N, CA, C and O atoms as a GROMACS GRO file, in nm:
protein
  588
    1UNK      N    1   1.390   0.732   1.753
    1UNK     CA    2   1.341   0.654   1.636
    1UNK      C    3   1.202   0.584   1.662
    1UNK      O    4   1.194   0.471   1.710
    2UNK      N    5   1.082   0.670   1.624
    2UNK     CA    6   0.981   0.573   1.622
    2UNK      C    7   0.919   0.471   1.576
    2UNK      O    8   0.911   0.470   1.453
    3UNK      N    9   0.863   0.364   1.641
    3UNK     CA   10   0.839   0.225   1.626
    3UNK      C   11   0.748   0.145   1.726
    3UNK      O   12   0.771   0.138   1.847
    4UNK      N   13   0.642   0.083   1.663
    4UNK     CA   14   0.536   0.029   1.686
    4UNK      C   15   0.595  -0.099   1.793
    4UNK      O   16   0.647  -0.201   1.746
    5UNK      N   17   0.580  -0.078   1.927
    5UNK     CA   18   0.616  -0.163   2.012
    5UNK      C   19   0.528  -0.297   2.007
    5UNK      O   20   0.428  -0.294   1.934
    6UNK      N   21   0.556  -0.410   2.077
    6UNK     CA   22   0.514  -0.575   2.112
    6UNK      C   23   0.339  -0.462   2.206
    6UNK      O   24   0.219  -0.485   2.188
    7UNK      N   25   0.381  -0.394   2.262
    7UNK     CA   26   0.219  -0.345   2.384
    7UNK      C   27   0.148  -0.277   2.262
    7UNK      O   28   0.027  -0.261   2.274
    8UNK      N   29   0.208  -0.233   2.142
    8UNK     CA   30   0.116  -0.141   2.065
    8UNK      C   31   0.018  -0.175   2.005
    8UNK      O   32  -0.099  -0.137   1.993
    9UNK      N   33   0.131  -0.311   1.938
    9UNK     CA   34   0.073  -0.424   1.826
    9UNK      C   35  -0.036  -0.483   1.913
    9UNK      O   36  -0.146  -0.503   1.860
   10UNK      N   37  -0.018  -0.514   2.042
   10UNK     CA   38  -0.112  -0.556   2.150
   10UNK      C   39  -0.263  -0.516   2.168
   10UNK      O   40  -0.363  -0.585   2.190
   11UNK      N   41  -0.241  -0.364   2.150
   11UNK     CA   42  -0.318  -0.262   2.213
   11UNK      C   43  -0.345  -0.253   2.038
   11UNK      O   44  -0.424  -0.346   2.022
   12UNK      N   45  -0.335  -0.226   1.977
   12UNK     CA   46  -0.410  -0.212   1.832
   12UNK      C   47  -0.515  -0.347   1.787
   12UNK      O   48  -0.631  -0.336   1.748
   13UNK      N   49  -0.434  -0.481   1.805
   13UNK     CA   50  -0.553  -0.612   1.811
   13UNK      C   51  -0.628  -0.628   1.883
   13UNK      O   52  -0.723  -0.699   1.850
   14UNK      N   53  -0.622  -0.569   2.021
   14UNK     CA   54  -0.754  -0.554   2.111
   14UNK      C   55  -0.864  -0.470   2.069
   14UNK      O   56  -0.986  -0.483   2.076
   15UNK      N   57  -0.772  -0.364   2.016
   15UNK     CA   58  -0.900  -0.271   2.025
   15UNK      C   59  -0.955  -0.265   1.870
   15UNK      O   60  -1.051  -0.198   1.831
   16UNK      N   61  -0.901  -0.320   1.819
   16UNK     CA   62  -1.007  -0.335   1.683
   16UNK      C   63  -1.085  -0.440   1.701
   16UNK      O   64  -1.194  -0.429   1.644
   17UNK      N   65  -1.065  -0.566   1.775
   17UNK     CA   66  -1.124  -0.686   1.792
   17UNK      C   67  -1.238  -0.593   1.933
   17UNK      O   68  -1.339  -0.652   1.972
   18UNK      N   69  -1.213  -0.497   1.973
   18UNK     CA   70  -1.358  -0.454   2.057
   18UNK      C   71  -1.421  -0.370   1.935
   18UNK      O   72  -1.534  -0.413   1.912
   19UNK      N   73  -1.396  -0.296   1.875
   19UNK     CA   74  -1.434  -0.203   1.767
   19UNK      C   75  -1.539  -0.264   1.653
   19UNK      O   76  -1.641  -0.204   1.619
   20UNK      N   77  -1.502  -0.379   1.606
   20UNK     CA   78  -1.581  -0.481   1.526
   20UNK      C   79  -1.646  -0.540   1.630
   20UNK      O   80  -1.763  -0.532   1.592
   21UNK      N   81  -1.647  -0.603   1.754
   21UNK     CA   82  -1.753  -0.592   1.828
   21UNK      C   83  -1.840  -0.477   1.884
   21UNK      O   84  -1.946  -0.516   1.932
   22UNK      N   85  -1.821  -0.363   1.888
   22UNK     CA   86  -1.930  -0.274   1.882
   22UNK      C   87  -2.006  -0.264   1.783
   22UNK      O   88  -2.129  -0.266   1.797
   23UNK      N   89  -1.934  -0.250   1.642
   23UNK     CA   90  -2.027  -0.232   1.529
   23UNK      C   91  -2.099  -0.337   1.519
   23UNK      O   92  -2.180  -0.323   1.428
   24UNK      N   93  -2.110  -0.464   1.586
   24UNK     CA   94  -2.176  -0.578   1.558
   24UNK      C   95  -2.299  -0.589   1.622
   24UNK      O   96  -2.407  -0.629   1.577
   25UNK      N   97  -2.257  -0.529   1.784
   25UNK     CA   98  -2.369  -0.469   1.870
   25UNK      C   99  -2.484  -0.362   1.813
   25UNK      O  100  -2.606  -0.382   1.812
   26UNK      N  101  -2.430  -0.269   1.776
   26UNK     CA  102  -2.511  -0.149   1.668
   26UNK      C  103  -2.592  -0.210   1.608
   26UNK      O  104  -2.706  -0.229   1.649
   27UNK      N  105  -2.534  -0.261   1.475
   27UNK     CA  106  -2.637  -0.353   1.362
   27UNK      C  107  -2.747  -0.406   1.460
   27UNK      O  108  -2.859  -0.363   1.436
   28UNK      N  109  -2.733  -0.504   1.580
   28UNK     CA  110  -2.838  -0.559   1.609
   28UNK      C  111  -2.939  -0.469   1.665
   28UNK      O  112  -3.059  -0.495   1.675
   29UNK      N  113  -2.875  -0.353   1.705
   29UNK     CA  114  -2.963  -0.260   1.776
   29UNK      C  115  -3.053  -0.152   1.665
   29UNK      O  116  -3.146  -0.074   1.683
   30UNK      N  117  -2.993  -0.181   1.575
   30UNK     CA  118  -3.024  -0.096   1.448
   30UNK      C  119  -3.171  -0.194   1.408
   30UNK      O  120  -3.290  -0.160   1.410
   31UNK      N  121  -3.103  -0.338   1.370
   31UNK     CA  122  -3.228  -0.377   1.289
   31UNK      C  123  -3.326  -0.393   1.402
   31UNK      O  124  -3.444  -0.381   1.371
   32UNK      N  125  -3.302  -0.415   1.504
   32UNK     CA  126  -3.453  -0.434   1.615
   32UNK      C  127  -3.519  -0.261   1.617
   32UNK      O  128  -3.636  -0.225   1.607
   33UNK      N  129  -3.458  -0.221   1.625
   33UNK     CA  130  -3.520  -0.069   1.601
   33UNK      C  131  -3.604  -0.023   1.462
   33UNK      O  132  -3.721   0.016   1.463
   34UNK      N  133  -3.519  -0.038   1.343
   34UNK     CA  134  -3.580  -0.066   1.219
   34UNK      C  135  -3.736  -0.102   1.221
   34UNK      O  136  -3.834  -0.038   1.184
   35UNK      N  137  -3.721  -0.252   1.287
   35UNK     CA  138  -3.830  -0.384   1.293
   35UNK      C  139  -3.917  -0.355   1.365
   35UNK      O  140  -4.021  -0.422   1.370
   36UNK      N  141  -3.891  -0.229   1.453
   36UNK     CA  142  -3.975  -0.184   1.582
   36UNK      C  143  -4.020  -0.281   1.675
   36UNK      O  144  -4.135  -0.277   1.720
   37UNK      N  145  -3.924  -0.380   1.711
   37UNK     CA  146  -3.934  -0.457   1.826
   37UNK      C  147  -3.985  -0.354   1.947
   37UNK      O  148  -3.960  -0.238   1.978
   38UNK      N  149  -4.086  -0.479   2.007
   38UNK     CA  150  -4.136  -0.426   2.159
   38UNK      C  151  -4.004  -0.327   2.270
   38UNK      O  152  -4.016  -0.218   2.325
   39UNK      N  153  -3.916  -0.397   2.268
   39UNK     CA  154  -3.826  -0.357   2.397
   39UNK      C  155  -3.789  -0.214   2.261
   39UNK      O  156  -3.860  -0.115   2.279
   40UNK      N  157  -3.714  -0.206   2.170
   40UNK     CA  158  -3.654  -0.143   2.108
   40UNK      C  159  -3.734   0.010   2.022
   40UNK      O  160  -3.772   0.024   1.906
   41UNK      N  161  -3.737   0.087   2.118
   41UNK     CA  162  -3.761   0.200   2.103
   41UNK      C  163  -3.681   0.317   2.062
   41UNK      O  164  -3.562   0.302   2.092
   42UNK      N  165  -3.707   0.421   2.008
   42UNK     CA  166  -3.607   0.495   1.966
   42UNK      C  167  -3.541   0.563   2.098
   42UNK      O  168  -3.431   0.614   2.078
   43UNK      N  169  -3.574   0.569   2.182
   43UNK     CA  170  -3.513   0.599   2.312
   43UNK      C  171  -3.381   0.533   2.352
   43UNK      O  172  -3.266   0.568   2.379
   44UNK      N  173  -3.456   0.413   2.344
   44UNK     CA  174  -3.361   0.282   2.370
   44UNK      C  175  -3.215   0.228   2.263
   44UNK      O  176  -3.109   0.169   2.277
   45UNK      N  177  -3.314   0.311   2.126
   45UNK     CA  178  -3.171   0.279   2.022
   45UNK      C  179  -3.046   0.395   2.012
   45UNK      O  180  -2.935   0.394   1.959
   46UNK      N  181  -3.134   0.509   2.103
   46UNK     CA  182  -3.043   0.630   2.108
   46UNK      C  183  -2.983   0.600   2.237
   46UNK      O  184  -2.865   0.585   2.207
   47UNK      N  185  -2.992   0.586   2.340
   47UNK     CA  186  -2.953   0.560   2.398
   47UNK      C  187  -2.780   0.424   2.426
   47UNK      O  188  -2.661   0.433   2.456
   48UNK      N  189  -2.866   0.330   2.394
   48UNK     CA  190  -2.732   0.226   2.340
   48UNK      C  191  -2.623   0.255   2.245
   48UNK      O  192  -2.504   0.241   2.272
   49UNK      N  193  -2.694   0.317   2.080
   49UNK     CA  194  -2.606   0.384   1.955
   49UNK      C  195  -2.519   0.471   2.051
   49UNK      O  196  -2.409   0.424   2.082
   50UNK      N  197  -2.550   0.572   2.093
   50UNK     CA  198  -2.504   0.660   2.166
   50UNK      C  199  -2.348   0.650   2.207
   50UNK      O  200  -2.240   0.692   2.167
   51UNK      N  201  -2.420   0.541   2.350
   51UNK     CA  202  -2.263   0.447   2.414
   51UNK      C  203  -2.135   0.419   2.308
   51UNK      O  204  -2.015   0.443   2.305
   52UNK      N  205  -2.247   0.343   2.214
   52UNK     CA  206  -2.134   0.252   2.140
   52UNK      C  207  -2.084   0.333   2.027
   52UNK      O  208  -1.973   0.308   1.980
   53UNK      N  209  -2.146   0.413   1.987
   53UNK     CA  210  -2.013   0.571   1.895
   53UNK      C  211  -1.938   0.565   1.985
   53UNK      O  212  -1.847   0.482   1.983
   54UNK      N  213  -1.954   0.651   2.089
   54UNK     CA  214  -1.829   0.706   2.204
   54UNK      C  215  -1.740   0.563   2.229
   54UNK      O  216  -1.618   0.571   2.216
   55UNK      N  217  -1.794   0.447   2.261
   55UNK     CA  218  -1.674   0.381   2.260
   55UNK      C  219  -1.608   0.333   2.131
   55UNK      O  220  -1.485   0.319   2.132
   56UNK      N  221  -1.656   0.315   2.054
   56UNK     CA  222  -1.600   0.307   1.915
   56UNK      C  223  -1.512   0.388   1.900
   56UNK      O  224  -1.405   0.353   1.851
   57UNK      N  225  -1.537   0.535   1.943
   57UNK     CA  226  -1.455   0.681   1.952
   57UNK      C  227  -1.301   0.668   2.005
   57UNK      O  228  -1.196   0.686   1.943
   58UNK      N  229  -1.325   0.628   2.145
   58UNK     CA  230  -1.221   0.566   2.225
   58UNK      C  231  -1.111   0.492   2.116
   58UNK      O  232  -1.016   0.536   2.052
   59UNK      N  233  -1.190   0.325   2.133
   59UNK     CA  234  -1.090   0.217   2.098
   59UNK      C  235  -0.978   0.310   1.903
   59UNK      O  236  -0.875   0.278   1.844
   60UNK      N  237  -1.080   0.420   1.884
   60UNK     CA  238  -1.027   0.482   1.769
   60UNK      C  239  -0.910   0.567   1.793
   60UNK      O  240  -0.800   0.555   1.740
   61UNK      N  241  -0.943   0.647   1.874
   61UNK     CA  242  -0.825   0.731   1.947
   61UNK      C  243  -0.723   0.692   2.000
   61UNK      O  244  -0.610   0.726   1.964
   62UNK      N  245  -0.757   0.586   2.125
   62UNK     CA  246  -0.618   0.458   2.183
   62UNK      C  247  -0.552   0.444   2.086
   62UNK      O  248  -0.435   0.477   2.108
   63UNK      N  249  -0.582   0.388   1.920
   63UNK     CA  250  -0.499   0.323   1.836
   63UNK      C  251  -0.430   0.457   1.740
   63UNK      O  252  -0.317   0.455   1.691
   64UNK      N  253  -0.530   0.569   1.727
   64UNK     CA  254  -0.452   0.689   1.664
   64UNK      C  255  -0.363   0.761   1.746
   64UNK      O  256  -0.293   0.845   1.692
   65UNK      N  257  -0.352   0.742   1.874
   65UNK     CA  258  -0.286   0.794   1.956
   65UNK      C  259  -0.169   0.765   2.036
   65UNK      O  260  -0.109   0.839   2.113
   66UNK      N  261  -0.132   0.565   1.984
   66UNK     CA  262  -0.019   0.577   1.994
   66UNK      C  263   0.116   0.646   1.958
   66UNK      O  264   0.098   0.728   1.869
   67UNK      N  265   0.225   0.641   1.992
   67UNK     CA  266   0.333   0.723   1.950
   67UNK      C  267   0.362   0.712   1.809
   67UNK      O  268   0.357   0.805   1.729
   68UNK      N  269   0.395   0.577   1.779
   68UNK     CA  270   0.405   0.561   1.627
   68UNK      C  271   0.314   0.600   1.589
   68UNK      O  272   0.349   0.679   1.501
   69UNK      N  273   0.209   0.601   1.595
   69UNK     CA  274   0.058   0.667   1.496
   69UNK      C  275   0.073   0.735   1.470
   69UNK      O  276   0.090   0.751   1.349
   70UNK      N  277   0.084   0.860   1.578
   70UNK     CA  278   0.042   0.973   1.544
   70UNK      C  279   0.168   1.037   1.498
   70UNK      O  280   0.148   1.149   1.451
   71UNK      N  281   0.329   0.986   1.498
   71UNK     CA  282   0.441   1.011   1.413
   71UNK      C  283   0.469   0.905   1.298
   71UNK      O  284   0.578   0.870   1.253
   72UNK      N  285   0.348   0.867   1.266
   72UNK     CA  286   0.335   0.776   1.151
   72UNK      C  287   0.465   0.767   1.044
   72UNK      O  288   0.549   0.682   1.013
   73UNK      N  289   0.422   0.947   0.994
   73UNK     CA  290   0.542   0.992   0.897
   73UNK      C  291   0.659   0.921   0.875
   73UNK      O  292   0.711   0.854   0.785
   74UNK      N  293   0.690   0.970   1.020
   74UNK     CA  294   0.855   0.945   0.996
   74UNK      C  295   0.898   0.768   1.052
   74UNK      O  296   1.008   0.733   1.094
   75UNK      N  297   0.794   0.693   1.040
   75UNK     CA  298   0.830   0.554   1.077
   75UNK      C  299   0.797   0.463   0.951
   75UNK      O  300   0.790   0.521   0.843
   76UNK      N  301   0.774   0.315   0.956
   76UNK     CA  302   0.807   0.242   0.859
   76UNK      C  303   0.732   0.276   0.759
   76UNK      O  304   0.630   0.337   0.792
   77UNK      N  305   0.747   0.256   0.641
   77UNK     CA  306   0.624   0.258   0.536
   77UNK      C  307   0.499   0.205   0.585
   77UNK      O  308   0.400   0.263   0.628
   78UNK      N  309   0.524   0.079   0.569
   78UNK     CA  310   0.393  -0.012   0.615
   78UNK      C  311   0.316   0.036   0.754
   78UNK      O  312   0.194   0.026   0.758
   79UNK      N  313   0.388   0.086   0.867
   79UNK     CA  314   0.286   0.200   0.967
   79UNK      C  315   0.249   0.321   0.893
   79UNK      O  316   0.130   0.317   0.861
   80UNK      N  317   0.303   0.417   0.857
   80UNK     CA  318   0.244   0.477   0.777
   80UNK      C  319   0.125   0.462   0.724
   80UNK      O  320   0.033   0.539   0.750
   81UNK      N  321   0.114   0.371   0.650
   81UNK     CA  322   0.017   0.315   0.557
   81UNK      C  323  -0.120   0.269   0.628
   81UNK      O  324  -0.240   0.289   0.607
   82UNK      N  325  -0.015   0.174   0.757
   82UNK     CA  326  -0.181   0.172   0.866
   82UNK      C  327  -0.223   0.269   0.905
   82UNK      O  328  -0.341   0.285   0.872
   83UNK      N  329  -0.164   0.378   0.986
   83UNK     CA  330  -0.218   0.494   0.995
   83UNK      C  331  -0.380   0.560   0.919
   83UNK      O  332  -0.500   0.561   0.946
   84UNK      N  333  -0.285   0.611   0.808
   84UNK     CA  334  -0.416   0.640   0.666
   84UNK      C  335  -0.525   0.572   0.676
   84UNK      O  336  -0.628   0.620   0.724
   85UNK      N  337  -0.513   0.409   0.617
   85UNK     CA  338  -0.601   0.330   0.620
   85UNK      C  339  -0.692   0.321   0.714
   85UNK      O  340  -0.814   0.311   0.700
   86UNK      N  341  -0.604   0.328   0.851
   86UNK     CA  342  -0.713   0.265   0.974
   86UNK      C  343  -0.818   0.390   1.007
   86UNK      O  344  -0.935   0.379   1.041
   87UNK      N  345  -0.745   0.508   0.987
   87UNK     CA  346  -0.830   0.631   0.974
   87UNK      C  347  -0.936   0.633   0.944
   87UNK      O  348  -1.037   0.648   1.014
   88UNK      N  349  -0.919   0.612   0.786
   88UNK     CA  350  -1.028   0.642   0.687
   88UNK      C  351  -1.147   0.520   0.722
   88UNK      O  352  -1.265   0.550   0.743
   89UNK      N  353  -1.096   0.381   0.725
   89UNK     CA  354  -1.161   0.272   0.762
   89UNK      C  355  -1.264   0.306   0.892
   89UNK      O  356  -1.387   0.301   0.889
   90UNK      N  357  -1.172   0.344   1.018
   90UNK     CA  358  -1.259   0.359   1.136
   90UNK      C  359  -1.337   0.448   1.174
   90UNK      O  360  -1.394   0.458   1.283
   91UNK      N  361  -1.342   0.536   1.057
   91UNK     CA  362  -1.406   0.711   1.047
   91UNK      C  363  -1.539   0.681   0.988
   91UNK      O  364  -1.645   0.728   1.027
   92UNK      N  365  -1.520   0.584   0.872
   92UNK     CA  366  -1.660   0.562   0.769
   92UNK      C  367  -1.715   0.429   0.832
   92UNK      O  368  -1.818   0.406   0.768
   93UNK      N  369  -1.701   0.334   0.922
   93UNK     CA  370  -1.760   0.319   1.022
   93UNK      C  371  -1.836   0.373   1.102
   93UNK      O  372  -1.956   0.349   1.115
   94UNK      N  373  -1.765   0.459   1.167
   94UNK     CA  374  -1.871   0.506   1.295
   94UNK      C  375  -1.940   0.575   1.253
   94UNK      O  376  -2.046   0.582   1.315
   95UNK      N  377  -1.927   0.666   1.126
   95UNK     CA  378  -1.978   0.819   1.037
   95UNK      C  379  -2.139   0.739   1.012
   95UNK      O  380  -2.246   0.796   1.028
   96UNK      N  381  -2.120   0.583   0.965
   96UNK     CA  382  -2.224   0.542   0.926
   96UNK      C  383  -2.333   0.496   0.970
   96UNK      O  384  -2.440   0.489   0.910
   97UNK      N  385  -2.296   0.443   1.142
   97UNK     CA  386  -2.356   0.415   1.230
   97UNK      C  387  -2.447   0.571   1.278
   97UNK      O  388  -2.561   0.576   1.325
   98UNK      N  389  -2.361   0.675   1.251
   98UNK     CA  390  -2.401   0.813   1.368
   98UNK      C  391  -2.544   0.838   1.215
   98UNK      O  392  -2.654   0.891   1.234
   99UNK      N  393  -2.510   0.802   1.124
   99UNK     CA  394  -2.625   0.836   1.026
   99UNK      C  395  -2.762   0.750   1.034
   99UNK      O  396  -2.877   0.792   1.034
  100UNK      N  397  -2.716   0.619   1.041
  100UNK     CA  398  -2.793   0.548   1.063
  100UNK      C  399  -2.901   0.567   1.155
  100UNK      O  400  -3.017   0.547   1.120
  101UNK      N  401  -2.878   0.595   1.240
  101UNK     CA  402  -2.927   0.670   1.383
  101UNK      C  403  -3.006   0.792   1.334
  101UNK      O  404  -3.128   0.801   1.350
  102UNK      N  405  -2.950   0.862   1.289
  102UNK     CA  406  -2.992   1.004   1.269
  102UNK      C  407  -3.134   1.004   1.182
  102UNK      O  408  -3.241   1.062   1.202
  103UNK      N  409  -3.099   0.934   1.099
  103UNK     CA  410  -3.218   0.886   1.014
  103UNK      C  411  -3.338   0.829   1.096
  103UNK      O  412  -3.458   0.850   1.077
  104UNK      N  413  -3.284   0.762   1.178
  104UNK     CA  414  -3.419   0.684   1.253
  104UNK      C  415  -3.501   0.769   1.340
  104UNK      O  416  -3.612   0.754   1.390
  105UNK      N  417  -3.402   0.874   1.342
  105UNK     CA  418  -3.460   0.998   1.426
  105UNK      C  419  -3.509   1.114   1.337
  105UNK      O  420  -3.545   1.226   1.375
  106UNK      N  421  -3.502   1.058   1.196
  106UNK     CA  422  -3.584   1.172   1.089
  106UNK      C  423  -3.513   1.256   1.061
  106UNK      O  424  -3.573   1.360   1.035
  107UNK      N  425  -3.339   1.265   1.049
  107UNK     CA  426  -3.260   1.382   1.051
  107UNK      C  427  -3.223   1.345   0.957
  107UNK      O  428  -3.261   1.229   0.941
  108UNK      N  429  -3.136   1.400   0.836
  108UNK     CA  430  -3.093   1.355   0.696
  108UNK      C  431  -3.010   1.456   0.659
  108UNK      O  432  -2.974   1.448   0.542
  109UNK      N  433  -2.956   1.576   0.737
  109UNK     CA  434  -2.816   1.660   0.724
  109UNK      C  435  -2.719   1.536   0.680
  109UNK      O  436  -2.646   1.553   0.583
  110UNK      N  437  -2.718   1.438   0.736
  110UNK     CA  438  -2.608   1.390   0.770
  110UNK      C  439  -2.587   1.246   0.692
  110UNK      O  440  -2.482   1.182   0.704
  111UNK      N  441  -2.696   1.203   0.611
  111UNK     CA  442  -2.687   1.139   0.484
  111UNK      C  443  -2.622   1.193   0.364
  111UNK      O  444  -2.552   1.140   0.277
  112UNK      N  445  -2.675   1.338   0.388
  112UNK     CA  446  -2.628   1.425   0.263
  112UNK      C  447  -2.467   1.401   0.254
  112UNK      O  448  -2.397   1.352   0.165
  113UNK      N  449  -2.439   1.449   0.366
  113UNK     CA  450  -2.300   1.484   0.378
  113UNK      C  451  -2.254   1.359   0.351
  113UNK      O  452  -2.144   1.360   0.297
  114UNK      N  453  -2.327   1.193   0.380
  114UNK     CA  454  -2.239   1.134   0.416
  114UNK      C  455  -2.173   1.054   0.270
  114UNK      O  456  -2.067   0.992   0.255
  115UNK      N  457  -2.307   1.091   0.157
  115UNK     CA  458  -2.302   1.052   0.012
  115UNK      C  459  -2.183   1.155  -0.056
  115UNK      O  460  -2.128   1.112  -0.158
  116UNK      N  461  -2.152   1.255  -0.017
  116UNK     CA  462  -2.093   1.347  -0.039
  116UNK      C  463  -1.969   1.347  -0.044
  116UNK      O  464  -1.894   1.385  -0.134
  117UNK      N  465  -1.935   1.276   0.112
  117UNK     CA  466  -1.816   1.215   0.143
  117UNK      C  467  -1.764   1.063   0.056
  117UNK      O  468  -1.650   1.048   0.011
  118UNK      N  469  -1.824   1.006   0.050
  118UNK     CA  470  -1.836   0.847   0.066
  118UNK      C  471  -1.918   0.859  -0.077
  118UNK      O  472  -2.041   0.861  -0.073
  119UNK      N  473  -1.849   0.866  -0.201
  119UNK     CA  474  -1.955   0.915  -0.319
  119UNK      C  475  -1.980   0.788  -0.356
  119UNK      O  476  -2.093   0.755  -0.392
  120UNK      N  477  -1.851   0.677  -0.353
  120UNK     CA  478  -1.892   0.530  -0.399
  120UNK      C  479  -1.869   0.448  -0.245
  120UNK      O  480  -1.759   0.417  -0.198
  121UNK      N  481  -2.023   0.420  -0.175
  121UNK     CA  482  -2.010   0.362  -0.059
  121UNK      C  483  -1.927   0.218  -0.055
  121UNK      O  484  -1.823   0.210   0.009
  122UNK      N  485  -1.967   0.132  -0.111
  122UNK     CA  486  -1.953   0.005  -0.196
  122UNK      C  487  -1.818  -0.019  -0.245
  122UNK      O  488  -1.808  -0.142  -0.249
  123UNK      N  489  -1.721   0.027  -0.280
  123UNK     CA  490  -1.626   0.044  -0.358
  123UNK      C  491  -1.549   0.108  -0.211
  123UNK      O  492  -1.468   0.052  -0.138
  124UNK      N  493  -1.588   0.200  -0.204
  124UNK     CA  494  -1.501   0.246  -0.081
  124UNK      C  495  -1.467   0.169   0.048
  124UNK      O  496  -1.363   0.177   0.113
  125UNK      N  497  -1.627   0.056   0.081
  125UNK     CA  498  -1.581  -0.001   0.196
  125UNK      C  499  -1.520  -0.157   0.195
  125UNK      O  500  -1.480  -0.221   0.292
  126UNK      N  501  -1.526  -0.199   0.043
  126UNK     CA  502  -1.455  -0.333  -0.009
  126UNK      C  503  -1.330  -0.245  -0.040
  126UNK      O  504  -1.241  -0.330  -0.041
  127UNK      N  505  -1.276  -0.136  -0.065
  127UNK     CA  506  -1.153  -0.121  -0.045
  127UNK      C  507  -1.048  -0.060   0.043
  127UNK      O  508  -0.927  -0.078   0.031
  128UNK      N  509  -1.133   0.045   0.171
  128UNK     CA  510  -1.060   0.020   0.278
  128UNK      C  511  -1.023  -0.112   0.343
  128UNK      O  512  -0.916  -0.141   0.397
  129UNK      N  513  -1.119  -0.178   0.329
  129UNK     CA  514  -1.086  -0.299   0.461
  129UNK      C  515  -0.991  -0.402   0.387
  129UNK      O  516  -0.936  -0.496   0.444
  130UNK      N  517  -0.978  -0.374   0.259
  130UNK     CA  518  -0.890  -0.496   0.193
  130UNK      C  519  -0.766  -0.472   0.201
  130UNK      O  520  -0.678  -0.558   0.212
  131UNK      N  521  -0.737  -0.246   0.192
  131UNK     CA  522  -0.606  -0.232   0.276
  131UNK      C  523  -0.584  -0.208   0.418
  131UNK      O  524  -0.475  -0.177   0.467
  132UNK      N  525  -0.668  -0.222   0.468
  132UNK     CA  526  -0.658  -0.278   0.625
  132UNK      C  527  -0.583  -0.392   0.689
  132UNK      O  528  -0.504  -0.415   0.780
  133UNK      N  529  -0.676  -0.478   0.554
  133UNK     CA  530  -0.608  -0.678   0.619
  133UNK      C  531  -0.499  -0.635   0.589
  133UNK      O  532  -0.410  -0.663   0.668
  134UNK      N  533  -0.458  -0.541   0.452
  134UNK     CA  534  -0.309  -0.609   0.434
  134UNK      C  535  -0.209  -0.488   0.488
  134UNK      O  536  -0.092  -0.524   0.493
  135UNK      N  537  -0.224  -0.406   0.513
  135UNK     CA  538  -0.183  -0.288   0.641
  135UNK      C  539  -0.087  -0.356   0.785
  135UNK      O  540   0.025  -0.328   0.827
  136UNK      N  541  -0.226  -0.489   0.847
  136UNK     CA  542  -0.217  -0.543   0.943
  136UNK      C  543  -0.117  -0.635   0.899
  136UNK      O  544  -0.003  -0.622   0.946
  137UNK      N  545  -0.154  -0.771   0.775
  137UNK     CA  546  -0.090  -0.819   0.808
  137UNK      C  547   0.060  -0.814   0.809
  137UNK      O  548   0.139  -0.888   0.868
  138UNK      N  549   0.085  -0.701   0.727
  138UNK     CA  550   0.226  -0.643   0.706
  138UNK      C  551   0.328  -0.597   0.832
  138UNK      O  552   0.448  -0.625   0.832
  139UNK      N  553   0.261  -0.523   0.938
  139UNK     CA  554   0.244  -0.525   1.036
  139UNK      C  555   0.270  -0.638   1.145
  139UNK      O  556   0.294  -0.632   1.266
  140UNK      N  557   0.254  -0.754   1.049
  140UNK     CA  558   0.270  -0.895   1.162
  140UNK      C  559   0.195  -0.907   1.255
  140UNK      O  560   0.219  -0.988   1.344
  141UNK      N  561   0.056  -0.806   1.257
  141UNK     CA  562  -0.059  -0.805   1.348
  141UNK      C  563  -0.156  -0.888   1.309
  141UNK      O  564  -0.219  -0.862   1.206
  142UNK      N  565  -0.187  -1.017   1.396
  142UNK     CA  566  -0.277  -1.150   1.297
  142UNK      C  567  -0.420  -1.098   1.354
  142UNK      O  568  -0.469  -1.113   1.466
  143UNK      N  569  -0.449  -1.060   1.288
  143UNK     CA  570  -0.616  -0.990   1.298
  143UNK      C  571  -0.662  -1.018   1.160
  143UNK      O  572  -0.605  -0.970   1.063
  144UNK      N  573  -0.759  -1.092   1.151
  144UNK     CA  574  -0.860  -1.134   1.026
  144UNK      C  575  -0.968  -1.030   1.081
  144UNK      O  576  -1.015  -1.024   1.195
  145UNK      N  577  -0.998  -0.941   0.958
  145UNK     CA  578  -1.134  -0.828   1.015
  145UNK      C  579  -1.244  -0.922   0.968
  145UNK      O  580  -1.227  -1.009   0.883
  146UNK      N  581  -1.325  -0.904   1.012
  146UNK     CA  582  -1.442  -0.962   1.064
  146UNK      C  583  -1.499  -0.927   0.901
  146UNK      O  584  -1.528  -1.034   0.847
  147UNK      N  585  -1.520  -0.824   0.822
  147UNK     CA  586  -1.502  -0.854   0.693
  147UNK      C  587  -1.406  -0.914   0.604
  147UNK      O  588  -1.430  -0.922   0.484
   0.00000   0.00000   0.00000
């Protein structure tokens, strides 16, 4: 019978509480790059962006890859439900960061796609994260997202 253990719930508030700290790291590395700060070169923003996808990647996988996760299905509703959510939530995250980037590097495949995907950006990301909070707090996981 699968079920979201006391280490899971553990291991899911850590690693979103590192996850919203990467994306927080990004942004700053984004707008100094933008701004074309002295130190902040596109070398330097590819380089850092880089890191912090792949670990973003990680703390994404750890949490899709627990047991309950990834047998979501057949466990409570409300995991279930995180499942989906945290998916879609932690996918159009990083998707947006890897564009962001791409752009700064003059590439725009990947805007296309990403309007394509994501047709109402705005709407989409005030309503993943609103079923996120309540995903979590259902969950009994006390994580306030940083949105």
């Amino acid at each position: 019978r699968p079920k979201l253990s006391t280490k899971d719930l553990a291991l899911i508030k850590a690693d979103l509480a590192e996850f919203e700290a990467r994306e927080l790291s990004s942004e700053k590395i984004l707008k100094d790059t933008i701004k074309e700060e002295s130190w902040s070169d596109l070398d330097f923003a590819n380089d850092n962006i880089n890191q912090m996808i792949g670990t973003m990647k990680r703390y994404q996988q750890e949490i899709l890859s627990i047991d309950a996760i990834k047998r979501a299905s057949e466990a409570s509703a409300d995991t279930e439900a995180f499942k989906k959510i945290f998916k879609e939530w932690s996918e159009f995250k990083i998707e947006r960061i890897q564009v962001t980037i791409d752009l700064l590097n003059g590439k725009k495949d990947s805007e296309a796609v990403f309007k394509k995907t994501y047709p109402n950006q705005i709407i989409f990301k005030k309503v993943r994260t609103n079923k996120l909070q309540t995903a979590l707090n259902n969950l009994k996981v006390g994580y306030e997202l940083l949105d």
